[PDB]
Design a protein around this nucleic acid. Structure first.
Ligand SMILES: [Mg+2]
Ligand SMILES: [Mg+2]
Ligand SMILES: [Mg+2]
Ligand SMILES: [Mg+2]
Ligand SMILES: [Mg+2]
Ligand SMILES: [Mg+2]
Ligand SMILES: [Mg+2]
Ligand SMILES: [Mg+2]
Ligand SMILES: [Mg+2]
Ligand SMILES: [Mg+2]
Ligand SMILES: [Mg+2]
Ligand SMILES: [Mg+2]
Ligand SMILES: [Mg+2]
Ligand SMILES: [Mg+2]
Ligand SMILES: [Mg+2]
Ligand SMILES: [Mg+2]
Ligand SMILES: [Mg+2]
Ligand SMILES: [Mg+2]
Ligand SMILES: [Mg+2]
Ligand SMILES: [Mg+2]
Ligand SMILES: [Mg+2]
Ligand SMILES: [Mg+2]
Ligand SMILES: [Mg+2]
Ligand SMILES: [Mg+2]
Ligand SMILES: [Mg+2]
Ligand SMILES: [Mg+2]
Ligand SMILES: [Mg+2]
Ligand SMILES: [Mg+2]
Ligand SMILES: [Mg+2]
Ligand SMILES: [Mg+2]
Ligand SMILES: [Mg+2]
Ligand SMILES: [Mg+2]
Ligand SMILES: [Mg+2]
Lengths: 114, 120, 122, 5, 209, 56
RNA sequence: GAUGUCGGCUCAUCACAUCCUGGGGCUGAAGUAGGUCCCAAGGGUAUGGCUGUUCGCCAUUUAAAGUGGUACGCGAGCUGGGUUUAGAACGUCGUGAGACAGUUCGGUCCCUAUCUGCCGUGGGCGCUGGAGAACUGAGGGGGGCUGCUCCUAGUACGAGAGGACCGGAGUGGACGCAUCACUGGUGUUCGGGUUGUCAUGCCAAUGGCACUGCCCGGUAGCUAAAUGCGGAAGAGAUAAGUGCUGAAAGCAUCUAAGCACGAAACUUGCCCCGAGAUGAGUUCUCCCUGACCCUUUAAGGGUCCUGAAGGAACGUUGAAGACGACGACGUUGAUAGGCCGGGUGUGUAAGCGCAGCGAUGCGUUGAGCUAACCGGUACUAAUGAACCGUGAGGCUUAACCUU
RNA sequence: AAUUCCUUGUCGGGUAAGUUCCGACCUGCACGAAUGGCGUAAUGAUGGCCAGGCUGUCUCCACCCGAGACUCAGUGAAAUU
RNA sequence: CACAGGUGGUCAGGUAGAGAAUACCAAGGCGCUUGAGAGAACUCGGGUGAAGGAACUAGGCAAAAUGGUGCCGUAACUUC
RNA sequence: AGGACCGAACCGACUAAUGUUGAAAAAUUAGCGGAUGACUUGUGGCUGGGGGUGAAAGGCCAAUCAAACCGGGAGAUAGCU
């Protein structure tokens, strides 16, 4: 698998920041409307991360206009322009799927004041 | 299918299979050589040998971890006091399997399994 | 994935709260309607004095689904519930004058540009 | 045993 | 048009500037060395026999060694043949590398599919299962009826039944050639191909065109 | 479910044509003890590959 | 001295009197869309409400929701709702026992496959010296569906409304094949949380049992809902049909002689099996170059010597597999296990200290543990051999090489 | 209607669509007053119908844990013919 | 039949629990008289499940689901 | 107080699956009904075949019931196979 490993390594993004589940992350994603490109921000709580090298991905959950939305971002995809950690949360689990059943006060996450 | 899977079921459930090897692992440590069916001996390598590797480094956490996997303080003392130091230089391969014919009762293929350093 | 008997919320102000899909249009033996697909629906619940009433048979376009939508790069967008926008049976144009909740980009068609213009988000 | 009336 | 024999390294993703993700199967095509050329005057058809890779000489049989020694070539994993068109010609001992596909847009990949062993009709032939409840007795996923009573009084040829599934030669056609890397003996083709990782693979230009 | 006619002696014989046992091709000879044994199996007296692996 | 019945489910196969798609002739065929007839069976040819129903009506789809044969196909394949055992009741008939193609509620569906058949997979022998490979392709099978949008073009046509043929492009439905890169499922062999109880002397820490005790996540593998590809172009000969030239019959005439066009049908093209194709084929390599003896003196038997190429067996095993088979490897070795490193998953181990009366928190610490995965490593197990298989390969004729 | 042949009677309700169900009509083939008529709270492993929740019942099956099936050793049937 | 059946009395420990239910145990008694491998279809007994949620079917058959204590609160119809 | 309520023992047998040459000539597994009463159960006793008993199914009367079982009339008769 040396052939595969170096093929992926040659196209892995190097500026990926460090973030953990429960962190509030703002993601800049390219969007096309006609001929002009644009960046739109998707901010939410990171509820799941899978580390698979070039295949790594993370899930961000937000409540938009009263509707819950979850986006699974490919970490190394060119579509996502940048990732920023707005706030750090303290959780005991790698996956926060239980947040899908909670809203408002019950969905609050403590800050990770290391 | 069984593609790229490991571990023999041995016509037992998970609970029975785990308990059997815990008992068999202690027997091999207590008695440096034991006689078992050939397929059982092959599986015993994946259980007893990691314990010997665990015994390489003597510490309270390792001893408790070994105890959790053997539940016999005599075996734990044997592993860390004698077996660990003896195999400190070997990089795996602490056991050897020798085929010894077939069982009279049911014609099951038998084999001896012993520690490589039984020489005395 | 919207099938027959599936209950969907309403993302427009046409007066209906939730509707039942009774037919997935666009083919024979077709059984799943995703975002941007037309489905025949029957109104199960509605507000009084609305422009539509319970028991009406119309068609709607699915705008949000739990199964989500797949992006060219492999990403996925999922919503907590299934929503649709009611359309006129004959002209298949939107009935409500406003859209509730986010909308998904695969509605970017000349036939649904009205929905996007009214969509609060993308 | 099946019947036939 | 002559093809090449390669190995299935695995599956990988390729990103593009536009933001599209292309799933590509990585195929390694080492130097394919021609071992024998079939001539019309001697064999009745035009073709070339090639070998790829290498194998330990300890396991090379004497009759096989002589065949390689005839062409002055090192023993490979095996032998494969490719038919020649009117304008194609090759010489014994010639080495063919992945640059052959440099200008090829579509290719056909053939190989032995994964072996599922003895498979039932539901898995093998997509047979619909019977009711799991409502009185069903030991017939939840059995094939069901297999005939039409006395008139035929037999089961016809080709009746779909349980049996060996997979582990057979399969060809996938019209796969885009994403990238050809001659410096590394790698061929990237969009989509999946038959067989497991490390299995022998045969790549030819798309006959469908 | 059950036979309609009694199968013959011939039919029984050809069904059993594949039931014949096969003898061991040969027995290995220990380099030290000289006792015959199954290949890759210890001998009766505990020898194997010239070494008395088993005490008994 | 028994051929179980309707309907449903599953699985079908054939016919063509063709429902859709394809090719045509007329049309009271302007176009669009139709009517009618001819050729065409390759593929395709709805989900629901009611009812036991087939059917039918209704709702909403579709290019279309074809008609029939096959024991009104299919219960040693399933179902048992309906008829049609014994119970009970209504209406009705009979004085009554009872009775009703009248209706109501309830009501045991057995069989381990010998043969034929079919789906898979082996052994034996043959193919005329033996052996290891790659092939030719006689034959056989699979596949063959189609919508919508755009362009041509708001052009031809038409008073207007409306609106193309013929040719291009794109994107779908259904179906089929392949595969796990992605999105997911599973993951009782990996972590963690937690209830009751028992035990390891006790604290602490762990283990057993309670559906894996109950749960939260999850590696590999398998897998679809996931994502790639496929149906075709092209060619040959044609159906209905349209023709050219052209007599019999000074004309006419697609036909009698002679030519041309013509469809998802047919033969090919595409994919798969395939020399048991006994008609047992072809090509390329590899191996064997001894003595004698007997008479029933011939494709004869036997002894001694010899044992090749190769195969098998055994062992370690596989994304190969019911068992056989198939693939890899056996020390001149990475086949499996273990081991080392890494990656994943879980989520801050134990011990110790610091805060707090305490539960607990914090530091050491993204710690500890980590299956099948990745890259390595002979530490363990894959033995020196034995076994099978031989010793130049019939006759006749012909053509060459010759004496 | 446990009774209605014609019959899926007609009308209304429920459903996108209801031969069943509920309400009503009376043209009761062939209800009817102790072989009782019509009501009736509670009760029913009773018959029919509808809704919420719930789900592999299903669209459409996938994986996994066990006992058989399969292979080896020992013992060793049966219907039928 | 050394048969998953049937068979009346008496004794009644610990923790949790209302309990002789249930779970884990004590005293005590047992692992049920063929085993060993493999990890195909299919059958049986179970676990989990993306989106939908009765579209299944004669019929929600079967499964799933509800499930305990106190406290608040509880309609029509009632023979009260 | 209760042919009261929930629920083990105990007595029942509504549904489903398995089993159907079964472990079993009527059972097993998961649910289900009654569970202070018209309850259930031990031991002994009584009713005998055109008779008994029957909260009534032609049910039950020793795995047999629209007339038990055993022996006898008896080699009933059989225009039938
Ligand atoms: Mg067993
Ligand atoms: Mg357990
Ligand atoms: Mg396989
Ligand atoms: Mg049954
Ligand atoms: Mg079943
Ligand atoms: Mg039949
Ligand atoms: Mg015949
Ligand atoms: Mg007969
Ligand atoms: Mg054709
Ligand atoms: Mg029939
Ligand atoms: Mg039937
Ligand atoms: Mg019935
Ligand atoms: Mg009748
Ligand atoms: Mg403690
Ligand atoms: Mg309904
Ligand atoms: Mg009524
Ligand atoms: Mg009356
Ligand atoms: Mg009662
Ligand atoms: Mg046997
Ligand atoms: Mg016994
Ligand atoms: Mg108990
Ligand atoms: Mg199994
Ligand atoms: Mg589900
Ligand atoms: Mg139906
Ligand atoms: Mg039920
Ligand atoms: Mg349950
Ligand atoms: Mg009571
Ligand atoms: Mg019970
Ligand atoms: Mg009770
Ligand atoms: Mg009666
Ligand atoms: Mg009796
Ligand atoms: Mg007499
Ligand atoms: Mg007589």
């Amino acid at each position: 698998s040396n052939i595969i490993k170096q093929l992926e390594q040659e196209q892995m993004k190097q500026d990926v920041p460090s973030f953990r589940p429960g962190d509030t992350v703002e993601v800049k994603v390219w969007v096309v409307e006609g001929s002009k490109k644009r960046l739109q921000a998707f901010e939410g709580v990171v509820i799941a991360i899978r580390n698979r090298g070039l295949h790594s991905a993370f899930t961000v959950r937000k409540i938009s206009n009263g509707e819950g939305v979850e986006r699974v971002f490919q970490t190394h995809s060119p579509v996502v322009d940048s990732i920023s950690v707005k706030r750090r949360g303290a959780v005991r689990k790698a996956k926060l799927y239980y947040l899908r059943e909670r809203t408002g006060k019950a969905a609050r996450i403590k800050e990770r004041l290391n | 299918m069984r593609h790229r899977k490991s571990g023999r079921q041995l016509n037992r459930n998970s609970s029975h299979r785990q308990a059997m090897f815990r008992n068999m692992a202690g027997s091999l440590v207590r008695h440096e050589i034991i006689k078992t069916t050939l397929p059982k001996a092959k599986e015993l390598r994946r259980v007893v040998e990691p314990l010997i590797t665990l015994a390489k480094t003597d510490s309270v956490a390792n001893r408790r971890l070994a105890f959790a996997r053997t539940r016999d303080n005599e075996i734990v003392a044997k592993l860390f006091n004698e077996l660990g130091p003896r195999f400190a230089s070997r990089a795996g391969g602490y056991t050897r399997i020798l085929k010894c014919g077939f069982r009279a009762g049911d014609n099951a293929p038998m084999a001896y399994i012993e520690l490589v350093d039984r020489s005395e | 994935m919207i099938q027959e008997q599936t209950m969907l919320n309403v993302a427009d102000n046409s007066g209906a709260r939730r509707v039942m899909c009774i037919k997935v249009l666009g083919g024979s033996h077709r059984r799943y309607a995703g975002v941007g697909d037309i489905i025949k629906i029957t109104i199960k619940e509605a507000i009084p004095r609305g422009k539509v009433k319970k028991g009406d048979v119309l068609k709607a376009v699915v705008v949000r689904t739990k199964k989500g939508v797949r992006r060219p790069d492999g990403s996925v967008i999922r919503f907590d519930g299934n929503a649709c926008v009611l359309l006129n049976n004959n002209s298949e144009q939107p009935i409500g004058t406003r859209i509730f909740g986010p909308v998904t980009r695969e509605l970017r068609s000349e036939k649904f540009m009205k929905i996007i213009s009214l969509a609060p988000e993308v | 045993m099946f019947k036939a009336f | 048009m002559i093809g090449l024999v390669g190995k299935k390294v695995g599956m990988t993703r390729i990103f593009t500037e536009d933001g599209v993700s292309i799933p590509v199967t990585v195929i390694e095509v080492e130097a394919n060395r021609v071992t024998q050329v079939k001539d019309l005057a001697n064999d009745g058809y035009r073709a070339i026999q090639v070998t790829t890779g290498a194998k330990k000489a300890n396991r090379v049989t004497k009759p096989e060694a002589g065949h390689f020694a005839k062409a002055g070539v090192e023993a490979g994993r095996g032998l494969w043949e490719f038919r020649l068109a009117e304008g194609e010609e090759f010489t014994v001992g010639q080495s063919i590398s992945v640059e052959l596909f440099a200008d090829v847009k579509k290719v056909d990949v053939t190989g032995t599919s994964k072996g599922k062993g003895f498979a039932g009709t539901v898995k093998r032939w997509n047979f619909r299962t019977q009711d799991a409840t409502h009185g069903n007795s030991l017939s939840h996923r059995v094939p069901g009826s297999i005939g039409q009573n006395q008139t035929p009084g037999k089961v016809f040829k080709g009746k779909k039944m349980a049996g060996q599934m997979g582990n057979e030669r399969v060809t996938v056609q019209s796969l885009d050639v994403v990238r050809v890397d001659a410096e590394r003996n790698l061929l990237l083709v969009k989509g999946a191909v038959p067989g497991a990782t490390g299995s022998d693979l045969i790549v030819k230009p798309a006959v469908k065109a | 479910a059950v036979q309609q006619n009694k199968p013959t002696r011939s039919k029984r014989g050809m069904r059993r044509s594949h039931d014949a046992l096969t003898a061991v091709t040969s027995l290995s000879v220990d380099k030290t003890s000289g006792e015959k044994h199954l290949r890759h199996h210890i001998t009766a007296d505990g020898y194997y590959r010239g070494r008395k692996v088993i005490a008994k």
